[PDB]
Design a protein around this ligand. Structure first.
Ligand SMILES: Cc1ccc(C(=O)Nc2ccc(CN3CCN(C)CC3)c(C(F)(F)F)c2)cc1C#Cc1cnc2cccnn12
Length: 273
């Protein structure tokens, strides 16, 4: 592994902490920039039984993050430890966890309608930036959105159709029909995923199609079935979800259009309830 001086951080500057979920740990970086300050960071490293391909996957992930560049609404690369020891990929720390967890914790036994629209605007803004960088996410969902201490949404990324997430959810439930059935991945298939993410925001971390297995989901998709309008969701925001879920990919709005519409909606959405 060659030392990249734009990103390299000496090992003696990284104080490894508690695991966050290869494997991700919380850590403290001494002098990432003054040199006398600690910055809380998240570090990705390989698990004890990692393969040669697991290592090559972490390298390529790091190399891609280097090319994407900085944005307020994406989890940004901060550094790396590549010399004389295991590969550490260092990113910004998001203290309020993933957006699914963030939302569920703030359900009534708090977030206004304007905060929820702002959440959707921020994710759309991060997606617009990734698209401008010629990137396709493939796994956009609230679990892949991180929330910082200051409530900033940051897009992140942590195949068998039957494999479930830790929470017991099926990732096929976020996939556009053409991505699922024809293996065609585009910004248009990501916009379909963003529609499922809007539904997740407005149900405050609700699970899409609960109890629906893969074979039954395929049937719902073939029939042109669409998820119901969440409670406390405007007609305009439900039409946005439905447009994101257009059967014809060219007819779906783009992230650029979604940012413009969400920007306008945020400004007209009240923070009084
Ligand atoms: C350590 C770490 C390493 C890497 C990444 C990461 O997100 N990598 C990433 C890889 C690829 C892509 C884009 N591609 C998608 C695939 N696609 C096919 C090509 C384009 C992106 C993206 F943001 F751009 F989307 C990100 C996140 C973390 C974290 C963390 C962290 C911070 N706070 C907390 C709090 C709790 C838990 N974790 N945590």
């Amino acid at each position: 592994l060659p030392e990249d001086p734009r990103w390299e951080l000496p090992r003696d500057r990284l104080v490894l902490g508690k695991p966050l979920g290869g494997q991700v740990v919380l850590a403290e970086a001494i002098g990432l920039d003054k040199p006398n300050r600690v910055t809380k960071v998240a570090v990705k490293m390989l698990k004890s039984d990692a393969t040669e391909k697991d290592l090559s996957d972490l390298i390529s992930e790091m190399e891609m993050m280097k090319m994407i560049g900085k944005h307020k609404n994406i989890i940004n690369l901060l550094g790396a430890c590549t010399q004389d020891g295991p590969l550490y990929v260092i990113v910004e720390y998001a203290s309020k966890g993933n957006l699914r967890e963030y939302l569920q914790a703030r359900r009534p036994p708090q977030l206004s309608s304007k905060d929820l629209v702002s959440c959707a605007y921020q994710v759309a803004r991060g997606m617009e930036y990734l698209a401008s960088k010629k990137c396709i996410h493939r796994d956009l969902a609230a679990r892949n959105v991180l929330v910082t201490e200051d409530n900033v949404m940051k897009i992140a990324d942590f195949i068998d159709y039957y494999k479930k997430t830790t929470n017991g959810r099926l990732p096929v439930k976020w996939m556009a029909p053409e991505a699922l059935f024809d293996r065609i991945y585009t910004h248009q298939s990501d916009v379909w995923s963003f529609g499922v993410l809007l539904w997740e925001i407005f149900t405050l971390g609700g699970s899409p199609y609960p109890g629906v297995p893969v074979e039954e989901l395929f049937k719902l998709l073939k029939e042109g079935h669409r998820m119901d309008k969440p409670s406390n969701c405007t007609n305009e925001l439900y039409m946005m979800m439905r447009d994101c879920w257009h059967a014809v990919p060219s007819q779906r709005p783009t992230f650029k259009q979604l940012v413009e519409d969400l920007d306008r909606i945020v400004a007209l959405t009240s923070n009084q309830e």
